[PDB]
Design a binder for this molecule. Structure first.
Ligand SMILES: CCNC(=O)c1n[nH]c(-c2cc(Cl)c(O)cc2O)c1N1CCNCC1
Length: 208
């Protein structure tokens, strides 16, 4: 059923640095998420170039944004390659330990946090606005899993006999009391227009 994993020390440190460092420009989280989705869609597209069956689990490659003012979530869905359980345990497909190192040094030499994605650990910026992050993922070569954490040095993984998804990744953000602007139509379109206007895949913003 539910396995529990400790973050490597370095991720745990990045996460804490992200949660505590005073830093106003929290909007970038959306850009790192959308850009992760796009990377993952590149990958299923690439793979399909040589094997068309790769797309049997769905041929539309797209990114939806789904706010929910009632649950206080913002969900980013994509029809990318997805991750296996191994990928979810191994820092969500990232090279997060070396990447946290280069980010740490960079930060001490005058990066700011908005530059997190140049170090390959953009996922973690989700913790700028979310108290808890659940990732659901289905890869063609594995079953559906949900990865979850509220930081604090640990994460969980479990099989998701929830809503089958076909193929993709779904990042539900459970937003902090004071970051509900990220749930407003007006405010999301603005961030997508500003940081994510040249993404090679349709982005749909759902309405409620
Ligand atoms: C090994 C093949 N799978 C993937 O690469 C993958 N599948 N889904 C994602 C993904 C990860 C995050 Cl954090 C996200 O917000 C969206 C994604 O699609 C993936 N990424 C995106 C790039 N960083 C590594 C994990």
């Amino acid at each position: 059923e539910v396995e529990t994993f400790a973050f490597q020390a370095e991720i745990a440190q990045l996460m804490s640095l992200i949660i505590n460092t005073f830093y106003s420009n929290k909007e970038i989280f959306l850009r790192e998420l959308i850009s992760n989705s796009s990377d993952a869609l590149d990958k299923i597209r690439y793979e399909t170039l040589t094997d068309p069956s790769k797309l049997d689990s769905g041929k539309e490659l797209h990114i939806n944004l789904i706010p929910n003012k009632q649950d206080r979530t913002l969900t980013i869905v994509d029809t990318g390659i997805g991750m296996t359980k191994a990928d979810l345990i191994n820092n969500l497909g990232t090279i997060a330990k070396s990447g946290t190192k280069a980010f740490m040094e960079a930060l001490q030499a005058g990066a700011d946090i908005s530059m997190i994605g140049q170090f390959g650990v953009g996922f973690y910026s989700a913790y700028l606005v979310a108290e808890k992050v659940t990732v659901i993922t289905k890869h063609n070569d594995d079953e559906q899993y949900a990865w979850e954490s509220s930081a604090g040095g640990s994460f969980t993984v479990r099989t998701d006999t929830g809503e089958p998804m076909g193929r993709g990744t779904k990042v539900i953000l459970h937003l902090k009391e004071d970051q509900t602007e990220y749930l407003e139509e007006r405010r999301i379109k603005e961030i997508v227009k500003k940081h994510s206007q040249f993404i090679g895949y349709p982005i749909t913003l759902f309405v409620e």
